[PDB]
C-alpha cells in the first residue's frame, strides 16, 4: 500500500521542517484516509486491535483478551482516542520515544536461522472473518475482452503451422 | 464404484489375505493427498459455472459448431452442452476425491460414445471442450491438484474417444 | 404447426380428429394465403425491423452496450443484433405455422440456460424483442398487427 495515491505529502513536509515528530507522523498515518479505507473498513474491532498492536507497539498480542479489552476504546472514543491511548503507553515511550520509527522487537533469536513470521505477513489487511464477503472471485461473469479463434492460435501437435517461421530460413539458399 | 480405499481393500480381500505392508503403503499414500483433494474439490464447486463458461468460450464457442448447421446451433442444443459439460466437471470432481476412476466408466463412460454417435454429437469437439476444461481447472486448484483433476479428465477423453 | 399438434393431440387419445379439430385444419389452410403475405412483409423488412429493433433496445438499455455490458464493442453489438435477427426469423416461422411450435423448440426451450450461461441479461434480450414488436406492428394493418405482435409477446412471456 505504498502507492502515490496513499502518500501523505503534507505530513512529509511538516516532518522535514521539524514541526512534528515521528510520533506525530506515526499517528498521522494511522488516522489517514488510506489506512481507514484499506485496513479499518475490512476488519472488525478485535482484529484491528491486533493490527495496531503489532505495527505500532512492535509486539504480538498477549492473548485473546487483550484484543477484547482494547476494542472498546475504538467503539466509544473512535479511532483517534485509541491511537492516543496506544502511543501514550509506557511500552511505546520506553522503546521508541517520540523520535524513533517502530519495528518488530526481538523477532529472531541470535544464533537461530529462522525468525517469527514478520507481522505484515502474519496479519494481512483482511482475514477469515471478511474472506467470505470481499474475496475477489476467480472467473466472475464479468464479460471481458474475447479471444475469438482457438485451434489456429496455439496449434495442435500435427499441425503444419509450427514449421512456418522456419520456411523463411529454408528460403532459396 | 470404488475409491482408493475400496480398491485397496478389494484387492487385498480378493486374495483372502490381510492388509499387508504393501496394501497399507498405498493407503498411506492416499491419506497424504487427502488434504489436497478436498481443497481441489472445494474451489471446483465454487467456480463450477465459471469454469464451464471459460472452457466453451476458449474451445468451441468461437468455432462454427454454433452456426445454423453446426452441432450446437439451437438453444435447446446449446443448453444441453453446458448441462453436458457440467457432468464431466462434476464426475471428474468425484474421481478426484475417490482417487479412482471407477465411478466414471460406471456412470459416465459406458454407453456414452455409443450415445453421441446416435445423436450425432461430434466426439472431436467434445474432447477438446474437456481438454480446455481441464486447462482451466489447473488454473484454479494449482499444479499438482490440477495434475490430479487433470488425470481424470483425459480418462474421460480417452474412453469417450 | 396447428396441423401437427392437432394430430398428436388426437393421436394420444386413441381417436381420430373431431369436427373441432378438422374444421380448423380446414379453417387454417384457407387462412394460408393471408399468412404468407404477413410473413412476406417481415421477410424483406429485416433490415429495418432489426436495425430499428436494436435502435430502441440500446436507448432503453444502455448498460448492455456500455463498457461492461455484455454487448460492448464492435464485436458483441454485431452479435447483439444477430440474436434479434434469429428471433425475428422464428416469428416468421410461427406466423406460417400458425403456432409458436417452431418458436417453442427453437429459441425458447431452455433459453434461460443459454443466456444465463453466456452472461447475457435475459431481461435485456426480452427488451430487444419488444422493441422489434413495435417496429413490426407499425408495418402492418390492425388486422395483421394483432397477429405479428401476437407472436412476439409470447416470446416475451417465455423469455422471463
Amino acid at each position: 500500500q505504498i502507492l502515490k495515491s496513499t502518500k501523505q505529502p503534507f505530513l512529509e513536509s511538516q516532518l522535514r521542517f521539524n514541526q512534528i515528530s515521528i510520533k506525530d507522523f506515526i499517528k498521522g498515518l494511522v488516522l489517514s484516509a488510506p489506512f481507514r479505507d484499506l485496513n479499518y473498513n475490512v476488519n472488525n474491532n478485535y482484529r484491528f486491535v491486533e493490527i495496531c498492536v503489532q505495527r505500532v507497539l512492535g509486539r504480538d498480542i498477549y492473548n485473546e483478551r487483550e484484543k477484547i479489552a482494547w476494542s472498546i476504546i475504538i467503539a466509544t472514543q473512535g479511532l483517534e482516542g485509541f491511537i492516543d491511548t496506544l502511543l501514550n503507553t509506557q511500552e511505546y515511550l520506553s522503546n521508541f520515544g517520540d523520535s524513533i520509527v517502530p519495528f518488530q522487537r526481538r523477532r529472531i533469536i541470535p544464533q537461530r536461522s529462522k525468525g517469527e513470521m514478520p507481522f505484515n505477513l502474519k496479519t494481512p489487511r483482511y482475514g477469515i472473518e471478511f474472506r467470505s464477503k470481499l474475496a475477489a472471485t476467480q472467473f466472475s461473469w464479468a464479460s471481458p475482452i474475447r479471444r475469438f479463434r482457438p485451434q489456429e492460435q496455439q496449434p495442435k501437435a500435427g499441425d503444419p503451422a509450427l514449421f512456418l517461421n522456419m520456411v523463411q530460413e529454408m528460403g532459396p539458399g | 464404484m470404488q475409491d482408493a480405499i475400496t480398491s485397496v481393500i478389494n484387492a487385498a480381500d480378493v486374495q483372502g489375505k490381510y492388509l499387508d505392508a504393501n496394501s497399507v503403503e498405498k493407503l498411506r499414500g492416499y491419506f497424504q493427498t487427502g488434504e489436497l483433494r478436498v481443497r481441489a474439490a472445494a474451489t471446483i464447486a465454487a467456480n463450477a459455472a465459471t469454469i464451464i463458461k471459460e472452457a466453451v468460450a476458449k474451445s468451441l464457442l468461437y468455432s462454427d459448431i454454433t452456426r445454423p448447421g453446426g452441432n450446437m446451433y439451437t438453444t435447446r442444443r446449446y443448453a444441453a452442452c453446458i448441462r453436458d459439460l457440467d457432468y464431466y466437471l462434476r464426475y471428474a470432481t468425484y474421481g478426484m476425491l475417490a482417487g479412482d476412476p471407477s465411478i466414471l466408466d460406471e456412470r459416465v463412460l459406458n454407453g456414452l460414445k455409443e450415445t453421441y454417435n446416435s445423436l450425432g454429437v461430434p466426439i472431436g469437439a467434445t474432447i477438446q471442450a474437456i481438454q480446455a476444461m481441464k486447462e482451466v481447472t489447473g488454473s484454479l486448484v494449482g499444479s499438482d491438484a490440477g495434475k490430479e483433476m487433470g488425470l481424470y479428465f483425459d480418462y474421460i477423453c480417452s474412453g469417450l474417444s | 404447426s396447428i396441423v401437427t399438434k392437432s394430430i398428436v393431440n388426437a393421436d394420444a387419445e386413441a381417436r381420430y380428429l373431431s369436427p373441432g379439430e378438422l374444421d380448423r385444419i380446414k379453417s387454417f389452410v384457407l387462412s394460408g394465403q393471408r399468412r404468407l403475405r404477413i410473413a412476406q412483409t417481415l421477410t424483406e423488412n429485416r433490415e429495418r425491423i432489426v436495425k430499428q429493433g436494436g435502435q430502441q433496445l440500446f436507448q432503453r438499455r444502455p448498460d448492455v452496450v456500455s463498457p461492461g455490458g455484455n454487448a460492448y464493442g464492435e464485436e458483441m453489438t454485431a452479435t447483439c443484433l444477430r440474436d434479434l435477427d434469429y428471433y425475428l426469423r422464428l416469428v416468421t416461422y410461427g406466423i406460417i405455422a400458425g403456432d409458436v411450435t417452431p418458436i417453442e423448440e427453437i429459441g425458447l426451450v431452455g433459453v434461460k440456460e443459454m443466456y444465463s450461461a453466456l452472461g447475457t441479461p435475459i431481461s435485456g434480450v426480452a427488451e430487444g424483442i419488444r422493441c422489434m414488436k413495435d417496429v413490426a406492428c407499425s408495418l402492418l394493418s390492425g388486422e395483421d398487427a394483432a397477429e405479428v405482435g401476437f407472436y412476439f409477446d409470447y416470446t416475451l412471456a417465455a423469455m422471463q
Binding site: - | 468455432s63 459448431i65 | 411450435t101
Partner: peptide, 22 residues
C-alpha cells in the same frame, strides 16, 4: 423430429472435423 433437429448431411460444419482456422 422437431422444428429444429439435426441431420448429418445438412451439417455443413467444420466441427466433426476440427480445422480451427474456420
Amino acid at each position: 423430429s422437431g422444428y429444429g433437429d439435426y441431420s448429418y448431411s445438412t451439417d455443413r460444419t467444420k466441427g466433426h472435423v476440427n480445422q480451427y482456422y474456420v
